[PDB]
RNA sequence: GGACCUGGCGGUGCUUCAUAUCCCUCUAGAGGAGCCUGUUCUGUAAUCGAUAAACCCCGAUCAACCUCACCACCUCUUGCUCAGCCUAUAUACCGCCAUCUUCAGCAAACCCUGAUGAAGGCUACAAAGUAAGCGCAAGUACCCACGUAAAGACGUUAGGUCAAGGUGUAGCCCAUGAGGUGGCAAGAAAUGGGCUACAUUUUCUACCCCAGAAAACUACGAUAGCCCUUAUGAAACUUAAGGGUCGAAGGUGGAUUUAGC
């Protein structure tokens, strides 16, 4: 009957069944989904199986300066454009099947590690390009209620970054990922941190800290010696710029208190000039591969004391036992020093 | 602190228990553990200013030999009255004299408390006669009165566990003027 | 209600109006005054200022009317007045002239008296306490023990004891029975206060 | 909970226009009638044919005019006349539209045995009410 | 006294209800002090006059016949 | 395994409450009888659905044929349809609803606290919250501004409905589709709702409220049974109305329970 058929809106509704007992708590799980499909897309006003040529409608009005008169497609000429049309729905739908495949993160289903591109541009006109983002973290938390019983929600870690020094993160929480992704990424540009690096490639001095029940312990390395630390404390490097560090994370792997702690001790490190100022002396760089050539890296800008620095016998300074064990081989692991891809 | 918690960060915050403030109150706020505590302390010591009060012999030579006892002491939250409940003697005609004489000292009690200015802003005080002993006082009223007449195993997956495509179809693939008249 | 909550109840007596101004206090003053500007619901039909009027009587014909028939309980009513009168006269023309003085010809009198000779002073009502409920003899109400007096007459002469008496003859023997201290409504007052009085020890509760 | 009629609340994104956003209850209060005829008086016939009626022009001008139509149409008879007011878009070249209202005219005319006209007012884009 | 509704309109901006009373509570605080007349107009633009309709029954008119 | 949070639950505390409302109080009922009607069970060759609140004179503002989807028998095969299917799945859905709701809350976007932990965000002489929108409210309908309707979000019960229609998936295609004839729907019984009663504030007649009779085995009381007639229909022991005959249980109904300001 013609008086029962419905619209496509109310026909997709029906037939895609996203609202629903099913849609409400994910009762339903949808390795195979009914995908809604446009049927009007392709279709032209006045095309129908017959082939007829309506004036004004499908074909032009006038043609030679005369007004067309009816007509209609021979069987041949109709097949063709029937085919056409086929073949133009394959096309489509091949151009739908050709989507540009995107970097994976630290493993092919994780979301650590994954770019979200730049934060969005600020109300006042205020723009992020020089910054990236990377997720650090991508959790499903579940929370009881009173009423609606166990429901997901999701919180994300992100870093942002500039690659001069100036990097942040914050937590996102939302109901949905991707609303989560805007709200950590744009929160975190407002708490960015300084941090300082050694010639814009290093920090200035090791760093070992300990953030509740997370401990890192930070080298500072020479050129060249890339990012040889934990993959979290690899991506927030290349946010900030570091390009040589070491780093060893024991106790608690917690992703927070990692990244916070990391943040923390980056954010406390004693430059060259602040040693200089806070001793009066100078601060005199001796490398190996210049041989005894004292390098100074950083003067007292008020006067220059004339005493010399007390030279205690012996330092009473409390040592990791870790690097004291390596220093001398006693340190054998079938893990530590092994081969791995440019950091 | 004891295990009754008293680390209050409001806890200089100058109690205030005025009928005014009642009316300014938000009633939307919902009162604290230890706002009870506060109501609770302050009835306490009401209990005791109408307590001692009750016991010396020259505030009112007529309430003293009364020897009058308070069963409770609460005062309204909205601070309208302070209920004073007193315990009811069995001997049915002196329970209206003890409480006669109850009502025509309140109203100087009220003053005399204004005396300990720490508790000077004291509601109308109410006095309540314990029903315990006064309850059956009115039946019995009516009961000598009354005229008797002449007497003669479905798998239930993980909610953590649950698989999700979201990242796959993200990593999968990226996700996909001028205006003139009588154109031609 | 189809009355808002502005609308006063309106006050029916000649009395309370022909009142000298001198007489009114300034309280009396105010309320008049205030009555000027509210608004006042329409006078019920029940109720008039005709001198016959009578609250009591006019209640007591509502609590015997069943299924809104008005017109057949004031029926009733008005022939249990008749039926009362007419038994008094007759006894009164049967008397001498001594005990003539004592004999009361009014039904309204009559009436009144046989009711207030049934009020229950104390009721028994189930107070609890300690998860039981106990009937505990309690003090009664003004109303309630009006209510009860016409409740318990009312029910005694629809009892189906009476075969094929009529309400008007019925009723009647009953108000005159009660007018002097006699009859089942009185008995149902007495018992109810000897209940009473049993359950003196659970008043407690 | 009443369903009938009821665009329910969203994210504040779905846009309705002026009749979409007004339940059945507010017909004759805040919304007028699509259709404007005398079987419905008191006293008047033909109540079942002019139901029929409108009911198919609805359906033959959704799929005359496809993805033209920013409204509902408004139907009006006076007589024996039969007028459709529709509110359309601006994206159909004015030819099409020349002939997709001579054409619906005259079919319609033949159709139902009345004179009917097709009155077309064009607007940028669907008008919005309001985004619930 | 003028409503929340009033004053709202009055001052052009959205107003909490214990906003209104302490506002309100203000004005009377100055009635019962010894107010002038420049006091006396501001307060006034605060006060709407309540028109009362009058309870007095309507009396029809006396009419004559043949 | 430790600590903590949330939810659920507690024969868990205290406090204040429900306004036809949880208890008592007020009025008329149900629960007992007959009848009407629904359901269950049983029965039958002989639908389905609803089925604690929130099913049970419910889908039906309605089944003698038809309706009809059931049973038996017979028949048709590109079939009223560019077929058809009341076949499975309401735990795939749209559509339209029940329910708390006789509620007042839901909430995008931001901001802040907890070390940037799961979490939390109020004090008015105010101490971190601001909030579009939705609901309530307002407004409108009915006789007012009252009342009654209407309205009543998000969420709860994978609540109801694939048999209103439509439709995803799966299944049937000489049959799970289509047509014809006849037939089923009863009551050992149980139960829900209703009607009529048990009578004297009643029954009959006149009247529409100043009457006369009736009033216990010829009273009250069946709208039941049986018989006849009429109405509708092609078709009526069957449906309805009326008349005749008949004159039964019932004598105001335990625990329990319904509605009304
Ligand atoms: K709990
Ligand atoms: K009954
Ligand atoms: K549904
Ligand atoms: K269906
Ligand atoms: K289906
Ligand atoms: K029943
Ligand atoms: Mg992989
Ligand atoms: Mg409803
Ligand atoms: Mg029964
Ligand atoms: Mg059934
Ligand atoms: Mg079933
Ligand atoms: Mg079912
Ligand atoms: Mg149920
Ligand atoms: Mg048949
Ligand atoms: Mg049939
Ligand atoms: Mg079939
Ligand atoms: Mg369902
Ligand atoms: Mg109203
Ligand atoms: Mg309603
Ligand atoms: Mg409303
Ligand atoms: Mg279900
Ligand atoms: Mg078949
Ligand atoms: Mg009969
Ligand atoms: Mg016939
Ligand atoms: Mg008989």
Redesign the pocket.
Known sequence: ?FF???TAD??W?????????????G??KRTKK?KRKDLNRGQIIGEGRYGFLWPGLNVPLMKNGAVQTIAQRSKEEQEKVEADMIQQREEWDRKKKMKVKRERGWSGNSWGGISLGPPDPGPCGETYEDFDTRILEVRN?????????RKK?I?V?VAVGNGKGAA????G????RM?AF??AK???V??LHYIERYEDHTIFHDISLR??RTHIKMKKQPKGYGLRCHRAIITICRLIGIKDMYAKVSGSINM??L??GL??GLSRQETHQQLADKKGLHVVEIREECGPLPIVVASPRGPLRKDPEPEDEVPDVKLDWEDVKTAQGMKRSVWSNLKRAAT | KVWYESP???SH??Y?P?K??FL???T???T?KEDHARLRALNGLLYKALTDLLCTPEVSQELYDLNVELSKVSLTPDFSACRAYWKTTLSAEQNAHMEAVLQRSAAHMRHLLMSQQTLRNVPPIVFVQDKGNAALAELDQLLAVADFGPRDGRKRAKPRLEQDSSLKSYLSGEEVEYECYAPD | ??????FKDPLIDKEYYRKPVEELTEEEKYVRELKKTQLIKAAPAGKTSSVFEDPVISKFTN?????G?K???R??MIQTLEAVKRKQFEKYHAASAEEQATIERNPYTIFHQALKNCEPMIGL??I?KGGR?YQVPVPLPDR?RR??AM?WM?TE??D?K?Q?????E?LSHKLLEAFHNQGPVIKRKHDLHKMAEANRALAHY | ??????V??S??DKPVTYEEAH????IA??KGWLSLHTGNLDGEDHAAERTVEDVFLRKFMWGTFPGCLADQLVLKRRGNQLEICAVVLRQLSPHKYYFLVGYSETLLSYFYKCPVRLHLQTVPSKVVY??? | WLIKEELEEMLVE?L????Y??FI?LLEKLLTSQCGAAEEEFVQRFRRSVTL?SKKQLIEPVQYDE
């Open positions: 009957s029962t058929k419905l109310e026909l509704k029906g037939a895609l069944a996203e609202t629903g007992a099913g849609a409400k708590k009762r339903g009914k938390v579940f929370t009881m209620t009173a009423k609606e019983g929600s919180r870690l942040g993160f914050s937590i929480k939302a109901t949905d609303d805007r709200k744009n929160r975190a407002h708490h953030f509740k927070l208190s990244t916070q943040f923390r | 209050s960060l409001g915050s100058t205030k005025s005014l403030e300014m109150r938000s939307s706020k919902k604290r | 209600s189809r009355y808002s909550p502005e609590m015997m009317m069943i299924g028939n017109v057949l309980a029926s009733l009502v189930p609890l409920f309630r209510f009860l409740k009312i002469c629809r189906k009476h094929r008496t009529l309400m008007p019925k | 909970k009443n369903r009938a009629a009821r329910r609340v994210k504040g339940a059945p209850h507010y209060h805040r309001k985004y619930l | 959205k909490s209800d214990l906003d009373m302490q509570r309709e």
